[PDB]
Motif scaffolding. Structure first.
Motif, PDB file in Angstrom:
ATOM      1  N   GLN A 528       0.786  -1.223   0.000  1.00 45.29           N
ATOM      2  CA  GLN A 528       0.000   0.000   0.000  1.00 45.29           C
ATOM      3  C   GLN A 528       0.824   1.282   0.000  1.00 45.29           C
ATOM      4  O   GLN A 528       1.835   1.393   0.692  1.00 45.29           O
ATOM      5  N   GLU A 529       0.378   2.252  -0.788  1.00 46.80           N
ATOM      6  CA  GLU A 529       1.043   3.543  -0.860  1.00 46.80           C
ATOM      7  C   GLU A 529       0.604   4.320   0.374  1.00 46.80           C
ATOM      8  O   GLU A 529      -0.445   4.034   0.951  1.00 46.80           O
ATOM      9  N   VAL A 530       1.410   5.290   0.791  1.00 47.17           N
ATOM     10  CA  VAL A 530       1.072   6.095   1.955  1.00 47.17           C
ATOM     11  C   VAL A 530       0.061   7.162   1.547  1.00 47.17           C
ATOM     12  O   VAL A 530      -0.085   7.465   0.361  1.00 47.17           O
ATOM     13  N   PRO A 531      -0.662   7.736   2.525  1.00 51.37           N
ATOM     14  CA  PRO A 531      -1.660   8.774   2.251  1.00 51.37           C
ATOM     15  C   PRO A 531      -1.117   9.887   1.355  1.00 51.37           C
ATOM     16  O   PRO A 531       0.020  10.335   1.514  1.00 51.37           O
ATOM     17  N   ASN A 532      -1.947  10.328   0.418  1.00 48.92           N
ATOM     18  CA  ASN A 532      -1.577  11.369  -0.534  1.00 48.92           C
ATOM     19  C   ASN A 532      -0.941  12.609   0.094  1.00 48.92           C
ATOM     20  O   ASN A 532       0.016  13.161  -0.450  1.00 48.92           O
ATOM     21  N   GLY A 533      -1.467  13.043   1.236  1.00 48.95           N
ATOM     22  CA  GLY A 533      -0.939  14.236   1.876  1.00 48.95           C
ATOM     23  C   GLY A 533       0.228  14.069   2.833  1.00 48.95           C
ATOM     24  O   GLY A 533       0.693  15.050   3.416  1.00 48.95           O
ATOM     25  N   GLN A 534       0.716  12.844   2.997  1.00 46.54           N
ATOM     26  CA  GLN A 534       1.829  12.600   3.907  1.00 46.54           C
ATOM     27  C   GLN A 534       3.114  13.295   3.467  1.00 46.54           C
ATOM     28  O   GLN A 534       3.540  13.175   2.317  1.00 46.54           O
ATOM     29  N   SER A 535       3.729  14.017   4.398  1.00 48.82           N
ATOM     30  CA  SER A 535       4.972  14.728   4.127  1.00 48.82           C
ATOM     31  C   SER A 535       6.048  13.774   3.631  1.00 48.82           C
ATOM     32  O   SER A 535       6.074  12.602   4.006  1.00 48.82           O
ATOM     33  N   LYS A 536       6.940  14.289   2.793  1.00 45.72           N
ATOM     34  CA  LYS A 536       8.030  13.493   2.248  1.00 45.72           C
ATOM     35  C   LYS A 536       9.005  13.125   3.366  1.00 45.72           C
ATOM     36  O   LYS A 536       9.695  12.108   3.289  1.00 45.72           O
ATOM     37  N   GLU A 537       9.053  13.961   4.402  1.00 41.46           N
ATOM     38  CA  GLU A 537       9.939  13.734   5.539  1.00 41.46           C
ATOM     39  C   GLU A 537       9.412  12.653   6.475  1.00 41.46           C
ATOM     40  O   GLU A 537      10.150  12.128   7.315  1.00 41.46           O
ATOM     41  N   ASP A 538       8.130  12.333   6.341  1.00 40.68           N
ATOM     42  CA  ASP A 538       7.529  11.280   7.147  1.00 40.68           C
ATOM     43  C   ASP A 538       7.737  10.006   6.331  1.00 40.68           C
ATOM     44  O   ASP A 538       7.015   9.758   5.365  1.00 40.68           O
ATOM     45  N   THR A 539       8.731   9.212   6.717  1.00 35.48           N
ATOM     46  CA  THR A 539       9.054   7.985   5.995  1.00 35.48           C
ATOM     47  C   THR A 539       8.325   6.737   6.484  1.00 35.48           C
ATOM     48  O   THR A 539       8.487   5.659   5.907  1.00 35.48           O
ATOM     49  N   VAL A 540       7.538   6.864   7.548  1.00 37.40           N
ATOM     50  CA  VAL A 540       6.806   5.711   8.063  1.00 37.40           C
ATOM     51  C   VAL A 540       5.811   5.226   7.012  1.00 37.40           C
ATOM     52  O   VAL A 540       4.930   5.972   6.580  1.00 37.40           O
ATOM     53  N   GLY A 541       5.965   3.973   6.596  1.00 38.63           N
ATOM     54  CA  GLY A 541       5.084   3.420   5.588  1.00 38.63           C
ATOM     55  C   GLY A 541       5.724   3.440   4.214  1.00 38.63           C
ATOM     56  O   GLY A 541       5.153   2.930   3.254  1.00 38.63           O
ATOM     57  N   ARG A 542       6.911   4.033   4.112  1.00 40.13           N
ATOM     58  CA  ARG A 542       7.617   4.103   2.837  1.00 40.13           C
ATOM     59  C   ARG A 542       8.685   3.014   2.776  1.00 40.13           C
ATOM     60  O   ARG A 542       9.199   2.584   3.809  1.00 40.13           O
ATOM     61  N   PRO A 543       9.037   2.556   1.561  1.00 39.29           N
ATOM     62  CA  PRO A 543      10.049   1.508   1.370  1.00 39.29           C
ATOM     63  C   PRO A 543      11.492   2.004   1.500  1.00 39.29           C
ATOM     64  O   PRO A 543      12.313   1.809   0.598  1.00 39.29           O
ATOM     65  N   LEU A 544      11.794   2.641   2.627  1.00 40.10           N
ATOM     66  CA  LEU A 544      13.129   3.163   2.886  1.00 40.10           C
ATOM     67  C   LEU A 544      14.129   2.019   3.035  1.00 40.10           C
ATOM     68  O   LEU A 544      13.963   1.146   3.887  1.00 40.10           O
ATOM     69  N   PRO A 545      15.179   2.003   2.202  1.00 39.34           N
ATOM     70  CA  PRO A 545      16.158   0.916   2.328  1.00 39.34           C
ATOM     71  C   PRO A 545      16.926   0.934   3.655  1.00 39.34           C
ATOM     72  O   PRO A 545      17.061   1.979   4.295  1.00 39.34           O
ATOM     73  N   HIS A 546      17.398  -0.245   4.061  1.00 35.34           N
ATOM     74  CA  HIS A 546      18.164  -0.438   5.296  1.00 35.34           C
ATOM     75  C   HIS A 546      19.240   0.643   5.356  1.00 35.34           C
ATOM     76  O   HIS A 546      20.026   0.793   4.428  1.00 35.34           O
ATOM     77  N   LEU A 547      19.265   1.406   6.442  1.00 33.29           N
ATOM     78  CA  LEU A 547      20.237   2.488   6.597  1.00 33.29           C
ATOM     79  C   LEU A 547      21.709   2.104   6.421  1.00 33.29           C
ATOM     80  O   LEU A 547      22.520   2.945   6.045  1.00 33.29           O
ATOM     81  N   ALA A 548      22.055   0.845   6.681  1.00 36.77           N
ATOM     82  CA  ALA A 548      23.440   0.402   6.547  1.00 36.77           C
ATOM     83  C   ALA A 548      23.721  -0.387   5.267  1.00 36.77           C
ATOM     84  O   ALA A 548      24.855  -0.801   5.024  1.00 36.77           O
ATOM     85  N   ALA A 549      22.694  -0.581   4.443  1.00 37.31           N
ATOM     86  CA  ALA A 549      22.837  -1.342   3.202  1.00 37.31           C
ATOM     87  C   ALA A 549      24.021  -0.913   2.330  1.00 37.31           C
ATOM     88  O   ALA A 549      24.770  -1.757   1.837  1.00 37.31           O
ATOM     89  N   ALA A 550      24.186   0.391   2.132  1.00 40.19           N
ATOM     90  CA  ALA A 550      25.282   0.893   1.309  1.00 40.19           C
ATOM     91  C   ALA A 550      26.646   0.519   1.896  1.00 40.19           C
ATOM     92  O   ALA A 550      27.544   0.092   1.169  1.00 40.19           O
ATOM     93  N   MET A 551      26.802   0.675   3.209  1.00 39.98           N
ATOM     94  CA  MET A 551      28.066   0.341   3.857  1.00 39.98           C
ATOM     95  C   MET A 551      28.311  -1.162   3.892  1.00 39.98           C
ATOM     96  O   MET A 551      29.458  -1.610   3.969  1.00 39.98           O
ATOM     97  N   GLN A 552      27.236  -1.944   3.846  1.00 42.37           N
ATOM     98  CA  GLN A 552      27.374  -3.396   3.834  1.00 42.37           C
ATOM     99  C   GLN A 552      27.783  -3.854   2.429  1.00 42.37           C
ATOM    100  O   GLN A 552      28.520  -4.826   2.273  1.00 42.37           O
ATOM    101  N   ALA A 553      27.324  -3.131   1.410  1.00 43.50           N
ATOM    102  CA  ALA A 553      27.664  -3.454   0.024  1.00 43.50           C
ATOM    103  C   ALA A 553      29.098  -3.021  -0.277  1.00 43.50           C
ATOM    104  O   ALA A 553      29.737  -3.536  -1.193  1.00 43.50           O
ATOM    105  N   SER A 554      29.605  -2.073   0.504  1.00 38.55           N
ATOM    106  CA  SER A 554      30.963  -1.566   0.301  1.00 38.55           C
ATOM    107  C   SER A 554      31.985  -2.215   1.226  1.00 38.55           C
ATOM    108  O   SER A 554      33.176  -1.924   1.142  1.00 38.55           O
ATOM    109  N   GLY A 555      31.525  -3.083   2.119  1.00 37.54           N
ATOM    110  CA  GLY A 555      32.454  -3.721   3.031  1.00 37.54           C
ATOM    111  C   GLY A 555      32.948  -2.789   4.126  1.00 37.54           C
ATOM    112  O   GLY A 555      33.912  -3.107   4.819  1.00 37.54           O
TER     113      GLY A 555
END
Ligand SMILES: Cc1cc2nc3c(=O)[nH]c(=O)nc-3n(C[C@H](O)[C@H](O)[C@H](O)COP(=O)(O)OP(=O)(O)OC[C@H]3O[C@@H](n4cnc5c(N)ncnc54)[C@H](O)[C@@H]3O)c2cc1C
Ligand SMILES: Nc1nc2c(c(=O)[nH]1)N[C@H]1C(S)=C(S)[C@@H](COP(=O)(O)O)O[C@H]1N2
Ligand SMILES: CC(C)(C)COc1ccc(-n2cc(C(=O)O)cn2)cc1C#N
Ligand code: MOS
Ligand code: MOS
Ligand code: FES
Ligand code: FES
Ligand SMILES: [Ca+2]
Ligand SMILES: [Ca+2]
Lengths: 1299, 50, 99, 50
Positions: A528-555
């Motif tokens: 499900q997509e988040v409510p139309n009026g939800q702020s871009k800064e409100d990431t709850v409900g969004r498919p935000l990638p794992h915060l450490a994913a980039a550092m894990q891919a870089s070793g």
């Protein structure tokens, strides 16, 4: 000679004292400080140590790039080679390489421990082919394992290299630009114009000679016949590391041109013995594409085997000569070379000879007919002739990178244009202590014709000639004998087909002649997509990638062992029991003391505090007087290097006096050996229920255990301060609280003296909920005793033996139901094998009992549980915590109820399903019961009914292949079984620049907990996530934390963090009102300036919990997580292999906080379940010694193991008012859905039995878990399984039989 | 001042998100933290002073 | 701590406020991830201000333990602490002071 | 502080300071320093990322 010169990431390395025993992995991590490459198994089967190697190939006059396992690559084989590691292609500090960016953004990284290795496998492929096909992409990972992701996201993200909202957007991906890749070291390109010279390397125990010419090699062999040759080191490495072998002198002939030459002759294609298997494969593929089909029969057979031979890393370094001369009983190539009479050119100083490989080439175990002074120079694989046909087959436990159970090469030569046998060769591997030929059987068919009579005669011959004693090593006697006949049947049919010209065979038999064929993948994720009026800064409900994913891919992501060692840091190696139960009569360390670098041997007597540990003060830190399981920790050796600690520990001599042992569940029951008393839940009137029942079914069922196989094994670093007993430890654990108290208890100091810090774990899955202390406490003692920092990271074999796993379960059940399928009575007695201590076993049985109903209402029901006390390592928590076992048992009898009733399985399941408001067997009301919705939507999206017709049709048109389809639901109770563990604390600080540091009791193991907590804090504070940070978990920021478990971490820590944020907002309020148009930074500074504290704790307690097994009352859980899965499979009735064709999942995770992470949890859990029920199996000797201690024998799901069509949907509009922002726990709930594959398999097996076994449509055959190829093949009873029999076959018929 | 122990700092770079952990002989952990963050150009929450 | 005995005094203070021996209290170090935005240790007021912050934190702890103390008057500090933990009451808190 | 053990890969720093009370820095030459065994690098203003 002496100087070893090579490059690493473009930088020149000059090693003046290269030790032949030093592997590239050790060198990278311990000498060069490049810790991105990881150790995951040390035996070449996980690919975590994958790196790329580049070199100038003189024979081809070209730069070649290939992947390799750093754990098996001796640095001494790398002179003038350029190594490229994960840190060499990109990083977050500079710029990520497209490969790293895509796996990160596509959510292909969870715990991240396998990411560098997979990144390098993909990278290598692209350096060879910038525009690969989907198939080439999948094949690049035959040697890489991932335990978290379920693989789908990794493949889907990399698929972009080929040629409802979405989880990621390919359009934002940086294009691949090969012109910007690092150049091949110019200095190396110069050295190419300098003729090679023999080199000599001297180590602590080994001497290595790199021979440059054929003459030098032959002179060396004449002078040192004992010297072991080494090329790929994929055999020798294993022998040295795992087989306690030591070869003082090694000669590497890899550089010799004659050993690398490829020649196309009139009789076939010749390959120098040093040629890598990947080269043979490439040359043979080109030959098959260019030459007539009739001349490439043998080539084709070789390719088929090479297809399932290890992975890309091993094949790129493994040489032809190495496989032939190692002469392992299970070689996949020798049977092919033997059956085809492949020519072997053998040489020695002054002598040369060429002989075709036949049954005599392998005299005995591990021996060939080569003289001590001879070496294999070249091999000529023959062109096939007219009237000559060939087949090669392999069957194992898992398709990819596995050891053959039975492997073969088969050839037949007919008289010109006839069906009359002139020559026949059937050679097998895995049926004796060497590659063998069924000569007695084949000789009898010479001059006979290819017909049914020959097929029958050959099968009976094989059944008699290829016999196996009940004590045959490797077991699976029935399965292996059946494969020997089944392979011939396949060969027989294939030959009829080839004879059929085509340029007849019953249509329903055709598929039996087809070789494995990959099907195009198709993945879909709906959320499900988040409510139309939800702020871009409100990431709850969004498919935000794992915060450490980039550092894990870089070793760059740091795991415990990646932390640098202090200059005075020592290493610890555990000394464990080799007996299941015995008295320790004496311990001799005389030999260990002689090992260089030895510091000391530690045991029970060295403990300053208490030697009593474990969750229930059930265990010893170090064995005292007696050992109670193989692997029982007796003590530990401390040395200056890991190698020295290992070698010293290996020579510690323990004298035992065996004591009676209790190993199996059966043994325990017979001897009445249990932990505590019976657990029981009873509701309704059983006696009455069975009375109303039209039918009654009773039986027994077994489900094997499971090894967590987190890519990162257990690890602890202990730093003794030297003040007031203070100690700071870095540990890979989900339980910092127990780690802290257990260490303090062992030391005899207050808990406030111990600090435990957890950054992240490369996987946990419950295996680190408690058992991590076995290592932590041992390391702490060593630090205490020596006064030096000390560390220990377990090798995979130690880990699998000592740390425990999922509990095997034995069940005895009896179910009463009506002709309609409605259940009226059910009794189930559960028995788990708990091991040598209680640990979490009781709670696990509790959860099992809590789920023996799954999603069905049973009016009258009685469930009991017993914990078997045995002499095996203590079993512990594993994703599911007993639920999967109970749920599996439930579905088993539910599947038997449908068959007995002769009604559609889904119909029977639906009518027995709970309804909104019903009470469970433990009397808890089911509010917001979403199974019905998940069920209907799944049936619809999976087109269940329509495909149910396709399945039936396929089964009518196929005699030796069958398909199965099954849809299963599930419900999982959320909350720790222990009420008081459902508490959580947080600590938040806002610094004067406005940046926020969040700390909470939960730990990160790849599930994305910190990511979710940052998302939560950001929403609550109404500020961008960019201003919030979570560094680690520590006992001095948040005390008395429950272990990160029970899937409730997001729930409770999210609430604790939320509360802490509210307190912060409350304090900032006055300043926000004073300066409404100000920034977050303005308000924070104003608060600071006004002396308002910007630090606070947050706390949460799950309300109304407390169930009692005494009164069967009270709320056990806060709510339930639901889901449904439909899976379709196809089984090979002749081999036991099977395809996971398609799986559709509908999961209810309420209003997901992050759909990307949650779908990842769903896919990851589903695949681990898939592993539990169909691939993973641990084998133990009768005396209790674990046989399977590595990826080579324990097969977890591989890239190719996942459903080809994989669809996952998150139930829409189903908010959960019971948890933070209406979300639901997702960690464990999806795992059981993996059982949908198990039951689809059993469905397919029923079709096969109806085909060749019985005619009884109501027959109920037993099928224990895991449904491995052995169980699948054995269950497909036919004329072949019957000919092999097992006990007292056509061999022994009793004298008399009652009438 | 002639404090018997002169000024001393140990800086441990983590390699992740600009993180750094420092052991310092200072009466001002707060300014040490912000000044190091300012020089590095990273948020203050990335710096730990002990 | 720079030799003036600040931690010693804080332990003495915490012990008096909590009514337990100093042997059960410990101060390991000063770190920015435990107490943020701290003023430098100077102006001779450390004992004054941190002593007060420690006192307040101690009061909060005592308040959380009170229900269990009253419930088991003859028990030990250890009994009350464990009872509070098992009753899921937080045993962690901040303390603050402003002159 | 200095009693804390050094990591095996831990390096040492030595400040380079002015010998003049007030002056313009015309140029800095590290050619000689680079010859000292164990030399790793010379850091200056331009190396500061923040
Ligand atoms: C993860 C993994 C998966 C594997 N899977 C398979 C598999 O599926 N099927 C299979 O059959 N094997 C498999 N192997 C075994 C191995 O990879 C093969 O046997 C391979 O060809 C060994 O070659 P190598 O060059 O690495 O041998 P090395 O270890 O370098 O040498 C092996 C032996 O051969 C000798 N030798 C080498 N060259 C010559 C020569 N020219 N003349 C005389 N003697 C020589 C050595 O002295 C030594 O005894 C696997 C190994 C690993 C680590
Ligand atoms: N990638 C990854 N996912 C995982 C694990 C892990 O070790 N790695 N452990 C599991 C188990 S057994 C539990 S109980 C939870 C814990 O996390 P949570 O409570 O935060 O959801 O995640 C599950 N998902
Ligand atoms: C008696 C004592 C508190 C020591 C027992 O400790 C425990 C008992 C049960 C559990 N546990 C219940 C679940 C689940 O229900 O999923 C998962 N884990 C964890 C611990 C810990 N640590
Ligand atoms: O609660 Mo998970 O660690 S089995
Ligand atoms: O305030 Mo003291 O540090 S002069
Ligand atoms: S560590 Fe090298 S393959 Fe696993
Ligand atoms: S992300 Fe692959 S093993 Fe954890
Ligand atoms: Ca384990
Ligand atoms: Ca146990």
């Amino acid at each position: 000679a002496d100087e070893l010169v090579f490059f690493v990431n473009g930088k020149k390395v000059v090693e003046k004292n290269a030790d032949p025993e030093t592997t590239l992995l050790a060198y990278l991590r311990r000498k060069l400080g490049l810790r991105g490459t990881k150790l995951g198994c040390g035996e070449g089967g996980c690919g975590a140590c994958t790196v790329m190697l580049s070199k100038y190939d003189r024979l081809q006059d070209k730069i070649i790039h290939f992947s390799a396992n750093a754990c098996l690559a001796p640095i001494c084989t790398l002179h003038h080679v350029a190594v490229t590691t994960v840190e060499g292609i990109g990083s977050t500090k500079t710029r990520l390489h497209p490969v790293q960016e895509r796996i990160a953004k596509s959510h292909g990284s969870q715990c991240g421990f396998c990411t560098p290795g997979i990144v390098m496998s993909m990278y290598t492929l692209l350096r060879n082919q910038p525009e690969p096909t989907v198939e080439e992409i999948e094949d690049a990972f035959q040697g890489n394992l991932c335990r978290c992701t379920g693989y789908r996201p990794i493949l889907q993200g990399f698929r972009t290299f080929a040629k409802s909202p979405s989880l990621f957007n390919p359009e934002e991906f940086m294009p691949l630009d090969p012109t910007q890749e690092p150049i091949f070291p110019p200095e190396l390109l110069r050295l190419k114009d300098v003729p090679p010279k023999q080199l000599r390397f001297e180590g602590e125990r080994v001497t290595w000679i790199q021979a440059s010419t054929l003459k030098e090699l032959l002179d060396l062999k004449a002078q040192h016949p004992e010297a072991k040759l080494v090329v790929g080191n994929t055999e020798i490495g294993i022998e040295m590391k795992f087989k306690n072998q030591l070869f003082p002198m090694i000669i590497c002939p890899a550089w010799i041109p004659e050993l690398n030459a490829v020649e196309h002759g009139p009789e076939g294609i010749s390959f120098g013995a040093a040629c890598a298997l990947s080269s043979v494969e490439k040359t043979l593929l080109e030959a098959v594409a260019k030459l007539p089909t009739q001349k490439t029969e043998v080539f084709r057979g070789v390719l088929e085997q090479l297809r399932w031979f290890a992975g890309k890393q091993v094949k790129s370094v493994a040489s032809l000569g190495g496989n032939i001369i190692t002469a392992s009983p299970i070689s996949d190539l020798n049977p092919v070379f033997m059956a085809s009479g492949t020519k072997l050119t053998i040489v020695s100083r002054g002598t040369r000879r060429t002989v075709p490989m036949d049954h005599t080439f392998f005299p005995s175990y591990r021996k060939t007919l080569l003289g001590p002074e001879e070496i294999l120079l070249s091999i000529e694989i023959p062109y096939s002739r007219e009237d000559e046909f060939f087949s090669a087959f392999k069957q194992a436990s898992r398709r990819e990178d596995d050891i053959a159970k039975v492997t073969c090469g088969m050839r037949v030569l007919f008289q010109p244009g006839s069906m009359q046998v002139k020559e026949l060769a059937l050679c097998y591997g895995g049926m004796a202590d060497r590659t063998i030929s069924a000569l007695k059987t084949t000789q009898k068919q010479l001059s006979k014709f290819w017909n049914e009579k020959l097929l029958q005669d050959v099968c009976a011959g094989l059944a008699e000639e290829l016999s196996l004693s009940p004590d045959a090593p490797g077991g699976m006697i029935e399965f292996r004998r059946t494969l020997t006949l089944s392979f011939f049947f396949k060969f027989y049919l294939t030959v009829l087909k080839k004879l059929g010209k085509d340029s007849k065979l019953d249509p329903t038999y055709t598929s039996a002649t087809l070789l494995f064929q990959k099907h195009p993948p198709a993945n879909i994720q709906l959320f499900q997509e988040v409510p139309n009026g939800q702020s871009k800064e409100d990431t709850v409900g969004r498919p935000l990638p794992h915060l450490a994913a980039a550092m894990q891919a870089s070793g760059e992501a740091v795991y415990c062992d990646d932390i640098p060692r202090y200059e005075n840091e020592l290493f610890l190696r555990l000394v464990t029991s080799t007996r299941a139960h015995a008295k320790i009569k004496s311990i001799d360390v005389s030999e260990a003391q002689k090992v260089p670098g030895f510091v000391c041997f530690l045991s029970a007597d060295d403990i300053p505090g208490s030697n009593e540990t474990g969750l229930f003060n059930d265990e010893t830190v170090f064995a005292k007087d007696t050992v109670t399981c193989v692997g029982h920790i007796i003590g530990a050796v401390v040395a200056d290097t890991p190698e020295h600690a290992e070698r010293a520990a290996h020579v510690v001599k323990v004298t035992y006096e065996d004591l009676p042992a209790i190993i199996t569940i059966e043994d325990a029951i017979k001897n009445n050996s249990f932990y505590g008393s019976e657990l029981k839940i009873e509701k309704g009137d059983l006696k009455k229920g069975f009375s109303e029942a039209d039918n009654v079914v009773s039986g027994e069922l077994y489900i094997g255990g499971q090894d967590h196989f987190y890519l990162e094994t257990h690890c602890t670093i202990a730093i003794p301060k030297g003040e007031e007993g203070e100690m700071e430890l870095f540990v890979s654990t989900q339980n910092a609280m127990k780690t802290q108290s257990f260490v303090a208890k062992m030391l005899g100091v207050p808990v406030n003296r111990i600090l435990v810090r957890v950054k992240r774990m490369g996987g946990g899955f419950g295996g680190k909920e408690t058992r991590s202390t076995l290592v932590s406490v041992a390391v702490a003692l060593a630090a205490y005793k020596t006064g030096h920092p000390v560390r220990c990271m377990l090798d995979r074999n130690e880990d699998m033996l000592i740390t425990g796993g999922r509990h095997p379960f034995l069940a005895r059940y009896k179910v009463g139901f009506m002709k309609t399928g409605t259940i009226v009575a059910l009794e189930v007695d559960h028995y788990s094998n708990a091991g040598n201590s209680r640990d979490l076993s009781h709670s696990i049985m509790e959860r099992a009992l809590f789920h023996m109903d799954n999603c069905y209402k049973i009016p009258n029901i009685r469930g009991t549980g017993r914990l078997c006390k045995t002499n095996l390592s203590s079993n512990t928590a594993f994703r599911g915590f007993g639920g999967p076992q109970a749920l599996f048992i439930a579905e088993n009898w539910m599947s038997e109820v449908a068959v007995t009733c002769g009604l559609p399985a889904e119909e029977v399941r639906w009518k027995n399903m709970y309804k909104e408001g019903d009470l469970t067997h433990f009397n808890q009301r089911l509010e917001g019961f979403s199974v019905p919705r998940c069920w209907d939507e799944c049936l619809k999206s999976s087109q269940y009914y329509a495909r149910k017709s396709e399945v039936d049709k396929f089964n009518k048109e196929n005699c030796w292949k069958k398909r199965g389809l099954c849809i299963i639901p599930t419900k999982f109770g959320i909350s720790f079984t222990v009420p008081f563990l459902n508490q959580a604390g947080a600590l938040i600080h806002v610094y004067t620049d406005g940046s926020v540091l969040v700390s909470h009791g939960g730990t990160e193991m790849g599930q994305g907990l910190h990511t979710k907590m940052v998302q939560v804090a950001s929403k609550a504070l109404k500020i961008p996530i960019s201003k919030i940070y979570i560094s680690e978990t520590s006992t001095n920021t948040v005390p008395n934390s429950s272990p990160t478990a029970a899937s409730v971490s997001t729930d409770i820590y999210g609430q604790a963090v939320y509360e802490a944020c509210q307190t912060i907002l409350k304090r900032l309020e006055p300043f926000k009102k004073k300066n409404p148009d100000g920034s977050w930074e303005d308000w924070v500074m104003a608060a600071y300036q006004d002396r308002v504290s910007l630090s606070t704790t947050g706390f949460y307690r799950t309300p109304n919990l407390g169930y009692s097994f005494e009164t069967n009352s009270g709320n056990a859980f806060h709510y339930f997580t639901y889901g449904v899965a439909c899976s379709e499979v196809e089984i090979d009735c002749l081999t036991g292999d099977h395809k996971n064709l398609r799986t559709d999942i509908v999961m209810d995770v309420g209003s997901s906080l992050n759909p990307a992470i949650d779908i990842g949890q769903v896919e990851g859990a589903f695949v681990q379940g898939l592993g539990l029920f169909t691939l993973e199996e641990l084998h133990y000797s009768p005396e209790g010694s674990l046989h399977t201690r590595g990826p080579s024998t324990y097969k977890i799901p591989a890239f190719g193991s996942i459903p080809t069509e994989f669809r996952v949907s998150l139930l829409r509009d189903c908010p959960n008012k019971k948890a933070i922002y209406a979300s639901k726990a997702v960690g464990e709930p999806p795992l059981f859905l993996g059982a949908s594959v198990f039951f689809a398999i059993k469905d397919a097996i029923r079709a096969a039995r109806a085909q060749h076994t019985n005619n009884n449509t109501k027959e109920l055959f037993r099928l224990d878990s895991p449904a491995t190829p052995e169980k699948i093949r054995n269950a497909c009873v036919d004329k072949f399984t019957t000919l092999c029999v097992t006990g007292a076959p056509g061999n022994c018929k009793p004298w008399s039989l009652r009438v």
